Amino acid sequence: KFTIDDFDIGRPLGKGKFGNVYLAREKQNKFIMALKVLFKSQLEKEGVEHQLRREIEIQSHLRHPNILRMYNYFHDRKRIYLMLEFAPRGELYKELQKHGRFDEQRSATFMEELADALHYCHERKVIHRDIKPENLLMGYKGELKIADFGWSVHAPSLRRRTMCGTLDYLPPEMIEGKTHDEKVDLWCAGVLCYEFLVGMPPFDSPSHTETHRRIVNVDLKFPPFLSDGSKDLISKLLRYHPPQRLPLKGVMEHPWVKANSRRVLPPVYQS
Amino acid sequence: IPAWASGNLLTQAIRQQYYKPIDVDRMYGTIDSPKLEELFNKS
Ligand SMILES: CCN(CCO)CCCOc1ccc2c(Nc3cc(CC(=O)Nc4cccc(F)c4)n[nH]3)ncnc2c1
């Protein structure tokens, strides 16, 4: 099966908590992909084998147009190689930083894509747990791709207790030490929508204590440039009570999303 | 950086691939994978 010698190596694309990503071309098919290269002795010394395993298990079994595909994986004496979809437009976070804030069409589009991907995950009892711009890539036509599943879990029955994610995105229930479920992803979607439109997350403060206070109080302060529709969606996602948050099908149906999204599904292989 | 991997040669290949997607489920999803249990053992 695969070895490194089956790929032309183009150039590096990014880092990663465990290792480097390269642009690559599978020689047989001239098919352009990305290869994430991990060093086995580094992973063992950091103690992260089981964590890496669970990430591979989750990502390699998801097939959705807005989730970055893992085609296959292989290993040699020293390295593990993950064969990944290439995202030609690159990091979403870089694009938000360059533009400052996204307009309503671009934001709504991304929300429809996010909600569809997340609903795909939830139907399979996968919780993402770290939705934020930095974990998203963009396809050839700008399509959102959920790229990183570092905090993700398969949770078919039990509520979870792990504090995880990113400060500005943490849901109240995490901060409060409660159990959590898939509805954490709803809250993070709401934070994301605000950050896309405003260019800063809603609970931004210089002290972690103040940010946590603002989160558990749901101290949301909408800037005046925001449309009523956008505020309506964010408000319905950022509920203190998990069961009261708008479901992901509800995001895909929300009138602001319908009116503003220009989502296009990529072409798929045809017989 | 080889030629394929930058500029317009890359752009054209990407466009091409977007509009003529291959059957990745067969071309790659059909090929054997190492057991996850074995990724840190001998190749
Ligand atoms: C507008 C042109 N830009 C100029 C760049 O100079 C962007 C060119 C494309 O840039 C990128 C950047 C990062 C990429 C990228 N990064 C990536 C892929 C992943 C998934 C991942 O590493 N999965 C994974 C799964 C299990 C275990 C594990 F350790 C990792 N994370 N991050 N993947 C694909 N294409 C990329 C394209």
Numbering used by the authors:
A (entry chain A): 87 to 357
B (entry chain D): 798 to 840
Sentences from the paper on this structure:
The Aurora family is a well conserved and well characterized group of serine-threonine kinases involved in the normal progression of mitosis. Mammalian cells possess three Aurora kinase isoforms (Aurora A, B and C) that exhibit different subcellular localizations and have distinct functional roles. The most conserved C-terminal region of INCENP (the so-called IN-box) is sufficient to bind and stimulate the catalytic activity of Aurora B. The CPC complex is involved in numerous mitotic functions, and the timing and mechanisms of each of these events are carefully regulated by its localization within mitosis. As expected, deregulation of Aurora kinases has drastic intra­cellular consequences, rendering these kinases attractive drug targets for small-molecule inhibitor development, targeting the active-site binding pocket which binds the ATP substrate.
Despite the high reported specificity of barasertib towards Aurora B, structural data describing the interaction between barasertib and Aurora B are still lacking. In this context, we sought to investigate this inhibition mechanism at the atomic level. For this purpose, we employed the previously described X. laevis Aurora B–INCENP complex as a structural template. The sequence identity between the catalytic kinase domains of X. laevis and Homo sapiens Aurora B is significantly high. We determined the crystal structure of the X. laevis Aurora B–INCENP complex at 1.5 Å resolution, highlighting the binding of the active form of barasertib to the ATP active site. Here, the first structure of the Xenopus laevis Aurora B–INCENP complex bound to the clinically relevant small molecule barasertib was determined. The binding properties of this inhibitor to the Aurora B active site are analyzed and reported. Of the many Aurora B inhibitors that have been reported in the literature, in recombinant enzyme assays barasertib shows a higher selectivity, with more than a 1000-fold greater potency, for Aurora B than for Aurora A, with IC50 values of 1 nM and 1.4 µM, respectively. Consistent with the inhibition of Aurora B kinase, the addition of barasertib to tumour cells in vitro induces chromosome misalignment, prevents cell division and consequently reduces cell viability and induces apoptosis. During refinement of the Aurora B–INCENP–barasertib structure, we noticed extra electron density corresponding to a well ordered arginine residue, Arg847INCENP, in close proximity to the activation loop (data not shown). The structure of the kinase domain was not perturbed and it adopts a highly similar overall conformation to the previous published structures of the catalytic domain both alone and in complex with small-molecule inhibitors.
